[PDB]
């Protein structure tokens, strides 16, 4: 609907630079560069964690025009930022790995 | 009771025509058990059924699966079976391949 | 829907459990212990087949009102379900290079 | 519907095939083998990039019976792709350290 479908389509824009960053985060540390790494997983972090606060919003207040049913970009919007999230998260541990690595 | 298990990494799809092949098989009294499963479980669940059927998608398995269940009948449902969900064909197919087995 | 519904936050909260079982025992590896770290991951993934095996019989009978259409929450919990196996076969792969890693 | 549920069940296994083959290429590196690793990943990229071209049209002349509302299906679909494309560009992540770490 007229928001809650700019809203998705918002949602899976930040969530998709969300990742954006989260690789460049991890090309960073490719570069050997664990400072600029971890500047750009925390901004990563935020971006996801704004756009989790506002699905969370939309869960809890689901639209529907019928009784128990829900806004169908409800779910489109979580895959992407299920998906957004969970890469995220691994990218971390790869970075990690990196810095092991001792490089 | 026969257990009829199908196989297909596409379990909404295949689930839609095993709940027509159980509604065919309470209409003729047809002492059967069907159940629908993703392909990765072929090897585990196969060993479990009396008939095992693939999907047209994973017909290309075919040699695989033989070789993996070699004291099952193993076969692929035919396609225009599946496309139409046609759940009386199907299972007569089915109870077929059992009785074709068992002499 | 009553079931359906109590069932999927089941899902969701067992899927969650998993990968939190999972992200712990990437924890075990980064503190050394991978007898820890085999055991959880063991653990996690049992987690996982006894969720992904109530999902399978979600999907092979799944309701819907209408023809076709099938129960909405069986896409929410396959998208947490997905995501925590994904995530928690991923997250053995980063053990195991750790493993590699020597500590 | 039809062909939809039909491709869509293509689409399914396209994306475990993809999948498969991501894990089969890493299981290459595993064993040493950066050549066959490499030439495996370009092959499963090159499947989903064809699954997504596919999807790319599903999405763009989404079906629906209703107004707004879309194909049930196309989400499903995209649950499938979104997880097998995510999980190799982490298993490609994975498959360069493996390189790294000299093995």
Redo the contacts between chains.
């Keep these: 609907?007229e928001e809650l479908?700019e809203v998705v389509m918002g949602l899976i824009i930040n969530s998709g630079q969300a990742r954006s960053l989260a690789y460049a985060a991890?090309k960073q540390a490719k570069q050997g560069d664990f400072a600029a790494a971890k500047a750009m997983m925390d901004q990563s972090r935020m971006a996801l964690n704004e756009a989790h606060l506002v699905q969370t919003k939309l869960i809890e207040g689901d639209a529907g025009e019928g009784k128990?049913?829900?806004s169908?970009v409800l779910?489109?919007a979580?895959?992407?930022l299920?998906?957004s999230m969970?890469?995220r998260?691994?990218?971390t541990?790869?970075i990690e790995?990196?810095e092991?690595?001792k490089? | 009771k026969k257990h009829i298990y199908l196989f297909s990494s596409a379990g909404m799809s295949t689930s839609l025509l095993v709940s027509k092949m159980r509604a065919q098989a309470e209409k003729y009294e047809v002492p059967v058990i069907i159940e629908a499963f993703p392909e990765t479980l072929a090897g585990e669940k196969g060993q479990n059924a009396d008939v095992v059927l693939l999907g047209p998608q994973i017909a290309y398995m075919l040699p695989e699966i033989q070789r993996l269940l070699p004291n099952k009948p193993v076969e692929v449902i035919d396609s225009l079976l599946y496309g139409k969900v046609d759940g009386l064909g199907v299972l007569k197919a089915a109870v077929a391949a059992i009785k074709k087995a068992a002499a």
Tied chains: 1, 3, 4.
């Design positions: 609907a479908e991890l128990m049913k829900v169908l779910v489109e979580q895959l992407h299920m998906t969970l890469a998260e691994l990218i541990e790869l790995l990196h092991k690595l490089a």
